[PDB]
């Protein structure tokens, strides 16, 4: 097939239906996220989603929230559909999302990871060492007591894509 | 009777008299809080009140001020009228306010609690450990020095109502 | 005379000529300050000045800069005119400034004081012990090597 | 005939061409930074550039990002064109930048200087001893590669120009 | 270095605003016997203009004047140069620019009050104690001063002053 | 108490002002009986005239009706009256002071008036004199020369406060 | 029959007003045969001129043409005529009285006019004097000085009912 | 050989008028060489000025630049010139007469001008006198002085056709 990347969000019909498809993949791959909570965040206007499309069908995505006053982005949800995982799609999504944030000159990623996702973010260059000060993210990024906070710092000079 | 909840504010005649109704309950149940000060805030545009209506009549409410630039909300007055207390009206009021704040992406409450109501705030999940940075609120919330600063974190995945 | 207190600032002819009177009084009483620096601050939109008027003319005031997101107010200029000093006017000015900030939930004054005025700030409750962390005020207040950083702590009050 | 203009992409052909010209001098004198990255910053509305013009033509400039919410300005690019160096143009540029900043009530400069240029900043008054809290700049100023963080404190009573 | 002349007045942006403060300062300081508030009232009066002498962005002198086109003259209200810039010909240069300005606006008479300590400066600017303009034309329009000498200057519009 | 001062006049439009103007017409007229009431009403309600009202507890207790001649560089004082049971308390002097401050703001620094014999002492205490410096060509025919009245002039000082 | 007085002129229109101005130009010209009809028509239709028309049974039987100079504080009387069959019945005097009442209510108190020899006695009886109180600088070159004519002035009392 | 007269001025003006004012500035410049040509241009193009242009075959051959002061009741004569090859043919007199006729219809009846030895005799033949009836207070600081020049006045009669 042919693969497309598209940053979208609920600020168009294909956008709306692509968003419903993202809420489906997020809900299926993250069974502990209440479905209504996914849809509330995914359809929220100051959230954006990097969609991974295969033949006009939503097969993955990274839902994120830019905090340019506080100088970082929240990674909200990460999913590739089940039969399309372990093929590098996750890595091309993250790399794409990184180059986009270069172009908007935000250079920091914050996210919470459970024990089953920590390996993925580590392999995208995320660390437990948080350089961003608490005074800047607490109360803006959604806390997850029980999961590890991870951070990734981008180089506004190297080609990610 | 017929119980209703409404987040009102002064930014209808029906709403005007509900605000006077809330200023009345707040004043009676907080008798050393100067009435003019209670009126000044309840009729302030940047403050809002969650009225509890029973059979068309105001019997309770929580008056608050959301600081979405700082990520928390300040709780200002809580009261139920004398002959409706100890029936759970307090709890449903707070639960409703939690739900209102989930849907508005503000997940932290801050309040001062006197020696007469800290047991209520404890039972609504408020703690003396403030996880919000002192710098986030020191210039925003009024300091009722003498009373105890208390904090409530909201889980946006749990249903509260 | 008729004594008035007004908190004014550059966004009206009356306010305007009051800011010029204030710049006059700050400049004449602090003559090693550049006239153009005082004027640039007094007419800065995010500074305010508490003007003390006696019979429609400025006789003193306090120019300040509030930092709400930081929990204090910087005190930039304090002057009373020469022929009206030693009369409690400096104390009424600072007192009014305290009430203003107690309404507005700012409970801390920060200021640099020199050897000619440090006693007057002491008498208004300033000390050399700075309880505001350096991380809250550094880079926000104009640091002045050679003068003494001093702090005043206000008691909060419920209106009426 | 020498002129100094603070310019930038607002929200004018002579302005637009000067910005193409600055972007060229920055690209040529800072070979490390990718030309595409220099353009996004020089043409960003939140960034400004102080242009040094010698007979209608750009020979130097300083690209800066003001953070008045934090009390400092980031100095992003410094360059004088090779044919015009060691003629005191860099000092005249930094002086005008200083005057521009005392009129705008910002009194700290923060920059990352590579080992090759630390001597120049040192002679414009910069120090390696950083009086701003780390928590105040981390994530706003682009952390640079291997460069030294430097700070310049301004005194709003000197006429720098 | 970097001398400029600007006719400004209060209609004001903050550059013009801060310059009027500078002028009011220079006037106030060189005219100690004029009340600061009176100088400020007139400098910021809309029907008043000031020719500012700007030296490297900073005010160092000026002439505050008030044009009376229907009366056919202009009132010279305040002249001052900062103490450390006096006796370099700056005062003369201000007056010449003010004469060139009024030639183009077809006002060819200046009226001013000078005290014994200022008569010599206006004399060397071409002013005279012989007042050709009639009293009916200026009395109660220009602000009289007790003890000051009234002085008049007549301009030639066929002569270039700057 | 609650003394107020208001400069009012017919605009060539408000009922509070209109009843105030009638109060002034009455006070002027009762204090100046040998002046036609119609003439006093005509001037008070004339648009290019103005009156400085002295309000005490909402009721008119005095005022000064004047005509500004900005083109001629002076203002004419037309009527001055304080109601009888409020005289000799400084109200006539406070009225003249406020009227002075008002004119300094409009760069009119000369008052002219034709005082009758009963008023000369009041005008003298407010700084008027018989030595008229405004040349006759500037005021003649613009103010009426009532035979037997005394032309009196007051010069205002724009550097000094009057209120 | 029905006598009316109307102050008219050629403004910035009415068919009745316009025929009256012809009637006035006719009366002035016939009663002043030694002034050129063309000149009488220029002034009578000049917009800065006004005529107080005496109307009897809808017909023009006389009038006064004047030029108000409010800036200079006087009015110029330009032409006075009553048609011959209606002279010596007080109409000339009523016109002047009406003209006086009109200027009183407009705050103008001085009339000026250049009378010829045959009109001195009429102006004398209407209160004019050869003794001119307005300074020469106020009227020279605003009113027209004809050689051989007598300047005459009338001073108006605004406290006097003229009509 | 077809001669016209037009009152033109820089109205704050089409192509024809603009090239005529430039002509007039050229002619005034050549015939009055002690006047800076930039001074003639400033006044000739001044909106408060006007010029009576003498046009012969579409070509400017003369004119009179004048400034009307209606509040003052006179007009200043600023420049008079006829081109050299058209002089002493009565052109300068038709110009002054056309200008007199223009001014009576605008109710201005005095002319003031400065003239040195060379020009004085021209103005005398147009009826100017060295005896000024306009008082000094009316024209001083309104008309441009020239020392070395004689102030001259001319009185116009509005019962007279000048052209
Ligand atoms: C944003 C807030 C969050 O934390 S959401 C939590 C993350 N989301 C989920 O875990 C949902 C379930 N997982 C998935 O949908 C996918 O496996 C995700 C995590 C999106 C990765 O997509 P995928 O298409 O497999 O990408 P990929 O082929 O590039 O694999 C990357 C390499 O990393 C390694 N890895 C180690 N641990 C993991 C892990 N838990 N999930 C995925 N990959 C992991 C894999 O070996 C893989 O290959 P390699 O190591 O580069 O050779
Ligand atoms: C924000 C600043 C403030 O306003 S602080 C002051 C709060 N307001 C007052 O004190 C006003 C007077 N009191 C009241 O209006 C009500 O009692 C308040 C405190 C609002 C509670 O409403 P109410 O409907 O009675 O409570 P509820 O039935 O939902 O009971 C919930 C549980 O709380 C417990 N509790 C312990 N201490 C108190 C207390 N001081 N007041 C009320 N309840 C208290 C009750 O026992 C009850 O316990 P449980 O559910 O049986 O486990
Ligand atoms: C914010 C940075 C600054 O502005 S620091 C510079 C302050 N300004 C100056 O030094 C300019 C010249 N001085 C002044 O304008 C006035 O003296 C100032 C300092 C404003 C005080 O106003 P003033 O009304 O005269 O004083 P006050 O009558 O209210 O007296 C209050 C008590 O303070 C005492 N005091 C001790 N040292 C001083 C001093 N240097 N200047 C003035 N007062 C001082 C007075 O004795 C008086 O004592 P007490 O109340 O009798 O116990
Ligand atoms: C983060 C912002 C950045 O751009 S960091 C990298 C700085 N930019 C570069 O290195 C680009 C290439 N160089 C240039 O464009 C110019 O030479 C720069 C560095 C801007 C200086 O301007 P320029 O006109 O040459 O300097 P100037 O004539 O005003 O001389 C001032 C004094 O500085 C001294 N200096 C010491 N080290 C250096 C150095 N590495 N480069 C330039 N000047 C340096 C010079 O000797 C000069 O001498 P002195 O003060 O009389 O002793
Ligand atoms: C109240 C009404 C008003 O208009 S204010 C009255 C005048 N104002 C003042 O005196 C204020 C204080 N004085 C000053 O600010 C300046 O000295 C003034 C008077 C403005 C002159 O400016 P300044 O730059 O010094 O003059 P300049 O360098 O062009 O010198 C020109 C020549 O004038 C002569 N002169 C005679 N008397 C004076 C005098 N009182 N002040 C200054 N110069 C004066 C000087 O000899 C000077 O030199 P020279 O004659 O050309 O060789
Ligand atoms: C041009 C307008 C006119 O028709 S001239 C008419 C002026 N009005 C009248 O004559 C009306 C009758 N009188 C009044 O209405 C009031 O008395 C007037 C004149 C307005 C003064 O008001 P009133 O408030 O009483 O006066 P005041 O208390 O402010 O001042 C009183 C001081 O003035 C002195 N004075 C000397 N002669 C007179 C006088 N003829 N009328 C009033 N005051 C006069 C008194 O000695 C008294 O002296 P002191 O300064 O109070 O100690
Ligand atoms: C220079 C350009 C002008 O417009 S000169 C203005 C005068 N007009 C003329 O001379 C033109 C022809 N005359 C007339 O139309 C009328 O006679 C004029 C002058 C307008 C008078 O109108 P008429 O209706 O007669 O007035 P009137 O009846 O009110 O007479 C009042 C008393 O005035 C007396 N009077 C003394 N001298 C004269 C005189 N020269 N012309 C007219 N009346 C004059 C008469 O005796 C008459 O009677 P009595 O004195 O009350 O008993
Ligand atoms: C600021 C001052 C001003 O308003 S401009 C001052 C005058 N302008 C000039 O002198 C410019 C050069 N001269 C000319 O352009 C013309 O010759 C002027 C003066 C405008 C006359 O026009 P022009 O067409 O030649 O005259 P005209 O034929 O209508 O009449 C000629 C009659 O005038 C007599 N005259 C006596 N003295 C002079 C004189 N100085 N200039 C011209 N004419 C003069 C001639 O003898 C001749 O006499 P007559 O009337 O025919 O019997």
Author numbering:
A (entry chain H), B (entry chain F): 497 to 507, 513 to 662
C (entry chain E): 497 to 507, 513 to 661
D (entry chain G): 498 to 508, 513 to 662
E (entry chain D): 497 to 507, 512 to 662
F (entry chain B), G (entry chain A), H (entry chain C): 497 to 508, 512 to 662
Original paper wording:
KAT2A is the first identified histone acetyltransferase (HAT) and succinyltransferase. Here, we report that KAT2A can selectively utilize acetyl-CoA, propionyl-CoA, butyryl-CoA, and succinyl-CoA to directly deposit 18 histone acylation hallmarks in nucleosome. By analyzing the co-crystal structures of the catalytic domain of KAT2A in complex with acetyl-CoA, propionyl-CoA, butyryl-CoA, malonyl-CoA, succinyl-CoA, and glutaryl-CoA, we conclude that the alternative substrate-binding pocket of KAT2A and the length and electrostatic features of the acyl chain cooperatively determine the selection of the acyl-CoA substrates by KAT2A. Superimposition analyses revealed that all the studied acyl-CoA molecules fit in the same substrate-binding pocket, surrounded by the sheets of β4 and β6 and the helices of α3 and α5, indicating that all the studied acyl-CoA could potentially be utilized by KAT2A to modify histones.
The studied acyl-CoA molecules can be categorized into 2 types. Acetyl-CoA, propionyl-CoA, and butyryl-CoA are type I CoA molecules without a carboxyl group at the end of the acyl chains. As the acyl chain gets longer, the terminus extends to reach deeper into the binding pocket toward Loop 3, which might occupy the space for the incoming histone lysine residue. KAT2A has an alternative pocket for substrate binding. The propionyl and butyryl chain could flip into the alternative pocket, orienting the reactive carbonyl group of their acyl chain to receive proton transferred from the ε-amino group of the lysine substrate, allowing the covalent modification to occur. Thus, propionyl-CoA and butyryl-CoA can be utilized by KAT2A for histone modifications.
